[PDB]
Symmetry: D2
Subunit: 330 residues, 4 copies
C-alpha cells in the first residue's frame, strides 16, 4: 500500500482521511497540524456535514489510533522538520493551503517523502491534473496539484461537450456552498470585501479561476471559458451552471445521451448522470466530481445551451486527491 | 388620490400596503382576505424581513386604522361580493394568485371597481406591463398584469443591452430567495417535486418563464431569451445572471457606461447601477426593480458577456405594482 | 412478523418506514396517503435530513417495491375504506395527525386492522405510552398513542432523576428544530401567530404540553412539571433544558452517575449518556429518545440543577413508535 | 459634547458608531483598527444585519468623513501610541476585546484620554456597571467596563423580580444568536471545541458567566444565579429564559404588573415590556437591553416561574456603552 501523510487537518484534510479508510491501496500513517491528538480525534469523530466517523477513534499516549492503526501526530510549522521517512511516507497530501509552490512544497521531499500532491491549484507552474481530463498526461513529476473543487466539476463535463460538439465559448456560474474562509457575521476580509459579509445572511458574488484553469488541464479549451461564483447559505454541495455556444448543432437529447454515455463509459466514477428531481443535499457524500442534472438544464436552440452539474465540494475533490495519489504512485 | 383595494394580504399584498404609505397619489381604503382585522394588524405591524411598520396600527371595532385612516376589512372568497363601490375603490390590486384570468379578475369590476392590476403574470392574454420596458404601450385596458418579480428585473436590463448592442441570444439564471410556496422541511409539492424539499437545507433548481415573458413586454426580444432558477436559503432578495451574445462588439466598459446612463436617465428609478462590493442584504428594501452590479459581471470577449443584476423580489415589484396603478389611472 | 400499515406519509410516516427496514419483527405492507406511488417512491428515496434511502425503491404498476417487497399504495381520505385485512395488517401506524381520538382512529379497526398506534398525543383519553416510562403499564388496549417527541425525551430523564433524588418541581425549555407546520417566510397561522413567522429568520417562542404530559405516563410527577419551547432555524434535532428542585441533595457527579447507570441498565436504548463536546448534528439519526449531555448541564447547588438532553425529534420517536407496535403485539 | 475615540471596529465598535450619530452629547472623533479608511467606510456603509448607514460616508485623503465630520483613522497595535489628546478624546470606547485589564486599558490614558470604557466584562477587578442595575454606584473611576450583552439583559430583569418578590435562587439559559467568534463550517477552536462546529448547522451549548456576573453589579444576588447558553443559527438578537424560585408568593399577573411598572418608571429605556406575539427579528434594532415577553413565560406555581426577556445583543449593549460614557463624563 501507498503510505500517505496529511499536512493540514482542515475540511479537505479530514475528508481525505475519511475517504482513505475505504481504500485498500492507501494508508494514512501520519497527520501534521497545530492541533493536539485528542482534538484531532474529536474533529475526526464528529462532523456536522458528514455525520459520525464510521469506525473507531482513540488516543493512546499522544498517538491517534484509528480502526486499530497508529497515526503519528506532529505539530511542525515548517515541513522540512516533518521527518516523513521516519514513518515511511511515500506521498504527502499537502492540504494546508500554504505551500502551493514548488519551492515550498518540496520541503516535504527534503523531509523524506517521495512525492507531493497539493490539494488546491498551484500558484506557480506546478502541473495540475483533473481526473477525467488529463491524468494520462502525468509524466512522472514529484510535485503535482489536483486543481480546485470547481475545476474538478467543470473540466470533465466540458471535455464531453467539447469532444462531441465543439465548444466555441462558454461562461459559467457556480452557486457554491459556504466555506471555512467566510465569516459567520459581517467581519474583516481585506483582500475580498464581499467575502467578509455574513455567510448565512447573503448571496455573495465571488471570483474564481476554475473556468480559466480548465484551459490548463484541457489546453484545447484554453481561452474559451471563464466564469464567476455566488456563495450561498448552505454548508456543503455546489453546482455549476455552464452556458456554452456549440460548433455542431446538438439537440438537448443528444447532449443528454452523450453525457450519459461518458458517465457509463470512459468517465465512469468521475462524471455522473441523473434525470431525477434532485436538490443539493442529494449529493452530500457524492464521490463523482461532476453529476449532470438532465432535467435542470435548458437549451435556447441547438447551438446555445445551459448545462447544470452538481458536486460535493468536499467529498468528490477529496476522493480524487486520493485517485491522484494512487495514479502518480503507479 | 386613487382609491385602491387590496385583494389578498400575502407577502405582496402587505409590501404593496407598506409602499403605498409613502405615496400621495394612492390610498389603500380596503383589504380583503380570510384573516381577522386584529390578525391583519399583527402581520402589518411586524415583519421578519422588513422590520416594524413605520406608523400606527390599531383595530377599532373590526376596522383597521392605519396612520389614522379607516381600512375596510372583509373576508369574501368570491370577488363578486366585494362591493368595492361602497368604499369608493378605483383600482383593485389583485394579489391572491387565484384570479389571473380576465374571466376571474373581472369579478372585481362586477363588484364596483374600475380597473384591476394582477400582481403576477396573467394566465390568459391579459396584457402585461413592466416599467422601463412597455408602460408607454398601455392602451386603456381595464384589467392588466404587472408580470413577475424576475421579469421586472430582467426586462429593463435587457432593453438597455439590446438597444445599445443588439442581443442575438441570451440565457439567464436567477439565484432566488426562498418564497412562501416552499416548505420548511421535506414535504408534499406534487406539481413541483424539487420545490417540496426543505428550503433552508437546499439549493433547489426551479423553472421560470420570466425570460420568455420578456419577449411579451419587449417583442423585439421574442424567442431570444430563456432561463431557469435556483432557490437558495435566503429570506429575500434575488439576483439575475444574464449570459448574452451581442451583435455589436462592446467592451465591458461600454456596457457599464450604457447601463449607468440608463439608470441616471430614461430608466431612473427602475434600473439602478452600482460599482460597490454589494451582497444581497444590501438590497433589502430596494425600490429599483433591477440594480446592475458592475464589479460582479464578467466578459469572455466583446460579444459574449455575463451580466449581474440585483432585485428585492418583494419591495421592487410591490412599488411597481403601485406605479402601474398610477399609470393606468392617469 | 407484525404486518404494519402506515397512514400518512409525512416526516414521521417516512422515518418510521425507514426505521422499520432494519427490523425483523415488523414489515410495512401498505401505505395510505394522498400521493401517487411514484411520488411516494421519490420522497422515500431522497431525504434532505437523512440522506438517500439505504436500499432499492421501484414502482411496478402502481405498486411500490422496496427492497423486493410489494407495498400496497392507496389514497383513501376516510380510513373506514382502507380494507387493511385485504393486505393482512395487524397494526396501523396512524401518522396523519387527523385521527387522534378513539372515535376517529377506530375506523382503522372497522377497516380490518387489529390495533392502532397514534404517532402523536391523543386528544381524548386514549392511553399514552412512552418507552422507559410506562410500557409495562400497557393493558391490552387496541388503540394507543406514543405521546410526543418531546415527552419521549423528557419522561425517561425525569423518571431517573425522580426515582433517585425526588423532583419537587421542574420547569423545562426545549430548543426545538423547525418542523413542517412552520412557514418559510412570514405567512398565515391563525391559531398560532408566532408560528407563522419565517422559520429560518427567527427564534420563535412556542407552547407545548410535553412537560404536563409527563404526569400522564408518570403519574407520580403529575402537576410537578411544565414548560415551553423555542423553535430555531435548524432542520432536525432538538434539546430539552430541565430545571429541577430536588428533594434529596445530590451533587452533579451523583446525577451524572445515576443517568449513566440508567443508560447502561434499565433504560438502555431509550436513554443515552455522553460526556463529549457534542452539538445538535451529532444526534442526527439518533435512536435513543433522550441523550443526557453531561458537560452541558449546570447545578447552582445540590438541590437546584439544570439538565440537558438531546433528541432527534424525527428518528428517536419513529423508532419508539415501532417499539410500541412490537410491545402491544406481544 | 464628549469626544469619544473607538478602539476596534468590530461588530460592537461599528454599532456603537451608528448609535452615537443620533446623540447630541457624544461625538466620535477617531477610530483605531487595522483597517484602511476606505474599508472602514465600506463596513460602516453596508450592514447585513442593520441595513445601509443612515447618513453620508466618504473618504477624503485617508480621513473618514461621516455626515460632514472628519474622523481620524489610525492603525496602531499598541494603544500607547494612539495620541488621543491630538484629536481631543475625552473617553475611549475600548472594543477590541484585547485590553480588558487595568494594566492594558490604562495605555489609553497614557496616550492622552481621560477615561476608558471596556465594551466587555473586565478580566481583573475593573468595576463593572450595567444601566438599570448599578450606574448610581459609579464613584469616579477612570477605567470601567459595561459588562456583557447577556448581563445587560439579565441584571435589570433580576433586580425587578428580586426587589418585588425576593429571588431565592435562579438558573438561566440564553438562546443566543451566532457571533463573530464562531465558524461557518466545522473548524478549529481549541479553547472551546463545541464553538468550532458549523454555526448555521447546529444548536451549540456554550458557557457564560453572565448570570454569575449579575452578582457583581447586584451584590444582593451574589451566589444566587448561574446559567448556560445555546448558540443557534440566527445572525442577531438573543433571549434569556430565567427560572427562579421566589420568596414571596406572586401570581404571574403580579410579576407582569411589576415588570411593566419598572419599564414605564425607574427602568424606562433599559427594561421594556410587551404582550404581543413577538419573535426574535421584532427586536432587531432594539435599544432596550431587556424586553420582557409577557406571553412567553410560564409559572408552575406562585413561587416557581420561568421568565423570558429579549435583547438585541448588538444594538442594546452598544447604546448602553454610550450611556455609560455619558454617565461617567457627568
Amino acid at each position: 500500500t501507498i503510505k500517505v501523510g496529511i499536512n493540514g487537518f482542515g475540511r479537505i484534510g479530514r475528508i481525505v482521511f475519511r475517504a482513505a479508510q475505504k481504500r485498500s491501496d492507501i494508508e494514512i500513517v501520519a497527520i501534521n497540524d497545530l492541533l493536539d491528538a485528542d482534538y484531532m480525534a474529536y474533529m475526526l469523530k464528529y462532523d456536522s456535514t458528514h455525520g459520525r466517523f464510521d469506525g473507531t477513534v482513540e488516543v493512546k499516549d499522544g498517538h491517534l489510533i484509528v480502526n486499530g492503526k497508529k497515526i503519528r501526530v506532529t505539530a511542525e510549522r515548517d515541513p522540512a522538520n516533518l521527518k516523513w521517512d521516519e514513518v515511511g511516507v511515500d506521498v504527502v497530501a499537502e492540504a494546508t493551503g500554504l505551500f502551493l509552490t514548488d519551492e515550498t512544497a518540496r520541503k516535504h521531499i527534503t523531509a523524506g517523502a517521495k512525492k507531493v500532491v497539493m490539494t488546491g491549484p498551484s500558484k506557480d507552474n506546478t502541473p495540475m491534473f483533473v481526473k477525467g481530463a488529463n491524468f494520462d498526461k502525468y509524466a512522472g513529476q514529484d510535485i503535482v496539484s489536483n486543481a480546485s473543487c470547481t475545476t474538478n466539476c467543470l473540466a470533465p463535463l466540458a471535455k464531453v461537450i467539447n469532444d462531441n460538439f465543439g465548444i466555441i465559448e462558454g461562461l459559467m456560474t457556480t452557486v457554491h456552498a459556504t466555506t471555512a474562509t467566510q465569516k459567520t457575521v459581517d467581519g474583516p476580509s481585506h483582500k475580498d470585501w464581499r467575502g467578509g459579509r455574513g455567510a448565512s445572511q447573503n448571496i455573495i458574488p465571488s471570483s474564481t479561476g476554475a473556468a480559466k484553469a480548465v484551459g490548463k488541464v484541457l489546453p484545447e479549451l484554453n481561452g474559451k471559458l471563464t466564469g464567476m461564483a455566488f456563495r450561498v447559505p448552505t454548508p456543503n454541495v455546489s453546482v455549476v451552471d455552464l452556458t456554452v455556444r456549440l460548433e455542431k448543432a446538438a439537440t438537448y437529447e443528444q447532449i443528454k445521451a452523450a453525457v450519459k454515455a461518458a458517465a457509463e463509459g470512459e468517465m465512469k466514477g468521475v462524471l455522473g448522470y441523473t434525470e431525477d428531481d434532485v436538490v443539493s443535499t442529494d449529493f452530500n457524500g457524492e464521490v463523482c466530481t461532476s453529476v449532470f442534472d438532465a432535467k435542470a438544464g435548458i437549451a435556447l436552440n441547438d447551438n446555445f445551451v445551459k448545462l447544470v452539474s452538481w458536486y460535493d465540494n468536499e467529498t468528490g475533490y477529496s476522493n480524487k486527491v486520493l485517485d491522484l495519489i494512487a495514479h502518480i504512485s503507479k
